[PDB]
Design a protein around this ligand. Sequence first.
Ligand SMILES: [Mg+2]
Lengths: 37, 500, 98, 35, 97
Amino acid sequence: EAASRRLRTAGKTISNQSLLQEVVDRDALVATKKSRK
Amino acid sequence: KNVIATQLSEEAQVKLEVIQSLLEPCDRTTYGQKLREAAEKLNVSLRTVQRLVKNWEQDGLVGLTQTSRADKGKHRIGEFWENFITKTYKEGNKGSKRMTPKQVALRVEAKARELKDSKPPNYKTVLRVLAPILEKQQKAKSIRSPGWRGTTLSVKTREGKDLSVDYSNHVWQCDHTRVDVLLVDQHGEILSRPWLTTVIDTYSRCIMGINLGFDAPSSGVVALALRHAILPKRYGSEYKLHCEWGTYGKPEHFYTDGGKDFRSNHLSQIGAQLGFVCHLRDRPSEGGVVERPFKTLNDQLFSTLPGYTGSNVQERPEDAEKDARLTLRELEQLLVRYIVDRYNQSIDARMGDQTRFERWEAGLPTVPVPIPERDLDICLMKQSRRTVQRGGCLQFQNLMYRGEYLAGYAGETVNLRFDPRDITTILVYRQENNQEVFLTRAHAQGLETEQLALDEAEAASRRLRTAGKTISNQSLLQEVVDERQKLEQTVLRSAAVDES
Amino acid sequence: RSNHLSQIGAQLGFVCHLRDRPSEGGVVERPFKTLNDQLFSTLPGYTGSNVQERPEDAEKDARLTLRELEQLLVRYIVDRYNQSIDARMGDQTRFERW
Amino acid sequence: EAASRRLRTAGKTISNQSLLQEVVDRDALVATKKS
Amino acid sequence: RADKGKHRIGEFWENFITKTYKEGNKGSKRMTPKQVALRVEAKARELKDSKPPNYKTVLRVLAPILEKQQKAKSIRSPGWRGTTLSVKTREGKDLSV
DNA sequence: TGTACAGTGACAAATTATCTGTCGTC
DNA sequence: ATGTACAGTGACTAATTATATGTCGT
DNA sequence: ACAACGACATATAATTAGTCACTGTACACGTAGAGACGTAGCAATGCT
DNA sequence: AGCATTGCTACGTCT
Ligand SMILES: [Mg+2]
């Protein structure tokens, strides 16, 4: 358990807040594409 | 052999509690007298209680419970008809035939009429007999594979040899997938789904480069992926990336799907010129380090984009061609942002300790040499067993050529290297001391005011000759310059060399 | 929707009508599946009703010719399909209801 | 129950003799197949 | 209890989850709950909300919606019965047979 | 020892619906 | 009011037959 | 001694095998094949 | 004289 809790705590350490920028700007791009008709 | 009792029922608990109430020891003459309470408690004679004691003292909780019957799972139709059913079904489902239990029952009834059997197996009897077979072949369909664990890994090759993966850049992989996105030209008609070809570092599970484009799986595609994989990266401020795709440098191996471009001469020339060894994949599963990222990337990216096309024809969503809206100059930016700002920083699925990126930078055996860009653009495609003319001149694919230093040589076997995207010039090579040595750079006769590609010159030679035109570089060039692939190629014309 | 067929109808004496949608066609769409299940699936080289379902060796097992498949399909229709009960009626075989 | 039983008992009287013999003859034909 | 089947994330998040999944599955887009939860994470961070819903809640929010979208595949047609029959022409004229 | 991500079971933490007391005149 | 209709299913029921019971037994 | 395992013949009941009325579900043109890169057929356009 | 090289066409064969 305590060994597996190392893997869990290590994975959870990611500074993910800089990684979210992809998702919101990908959607913003797709919403910027209006259809041809 | 240990066997444990399970599904202890209420009646078994009733039977157990009286057994426990007589597990308390006493003299045998009162033992045979205190157990009399069981008689009405079980509504049965003490001779059954003596039998129950004989079971429990012999068998514990397992024999205290009632068994299944001896005929459970035994079919009273007998071995002939149970053989007949399982014979008929398995032979009826060999190869591409797919007989079903209903079709089997018709065979049973047919054979019974021949046998004059008064009472052949009913269809539901025939269906019952096959239920074990259907279930056993169902479970055989979905068995999970463990996958590798920890840092140690080795990759099986079609050679039979198994090759360990020891450090970052020890073994790269590639394959191509058809992207599940319909995307469109400028202003935008539907075109068709592109191909994606990726380089994956088998140690870090990292991803050093991709080529995305409408081009079919071809050695020029693989070469342009390696041209991306191997070079240092610089992406323009128009991407607004947060992270830098710092993976570069060269492989010691290239382990790959056995596609015809991966088996090509051109790539083998790259293997010799860059020092990696091409290794073939045995079966698709061994590729999983690159097969699976298509699944990962389909799920986390393409499925969210307007032109998504589903994982199969049978799942193909009908709006895909109704509102496909990206061009590849956007799909590139989406895919590149997904890799560099997310996927590079994503955790490696069986290390946990670090990102995909850090298992590359910390795992490579030593800092690789960043090669000159022009050197890979000297690792062009080459042609051999051709000959130089007895003059200052040359030929290639019905083009005609000049060369500055060729006049010092008589007509002799020559080797030559060319950019298929800029066949305006060739680099020429000689076999001095059994080693390749430069002759000269060379040019098509009089060609300087414009530039030419190989694919359009090849197509022009077809319309050139079939019209009976006099064959020359002069006339061939006109048939280049006098459409689906035109739209596709002029999309791919959008390139970072104009933007960096 | 061809002129040829509409001209046959005018000659032979029937009007040509089109269904709204395939569901309204079920009376004709269904015998295919009764053929698909009860005939084509039990023959060498059955190709499976879908790309996700083609047998792994349909091309390897492929051996029937057009004259042979027709000679079976006619035995199926004459001795079997038309002799089955009409599924609305239960009492009448499809030919006796004709 | 009676409506069903009459409907069912009608269906039971239909002879499969043709519908059955074609089944073994289809296999006896296909038994000649080799790739 | 009166609370069974009703979530505690509240009216704003119950909508935002279901809004985001609904827009992500029109056209050929096929945004699954995980991508919604990843949007929820992004939304809370930009909302400055310190307690975004967990992916298990987001999957439980959509579970009835997913089942309603599933049931539509199964709905059976009664069919015609007995002797009387007609066929539906696209002219709109039911031709008796 | 293919790969590995989205979905799911079994459970703990937290919330909170509501149902169980000792009670008061009815 | 009504797409089609066959193969597979469930929920019993008739027949089989494995084996639990009650008395005697030594 | 008499409470221990037999010797039943007969119930007891849990197995299978069979009857039916329901119902889900595919029938709706559709993957054989595009598109690369050989080993091997070829012509040709040169020339000594 | 001699072939000798050069630019197509299969017929797979693979993804
Ligand atoms: Mg491949």
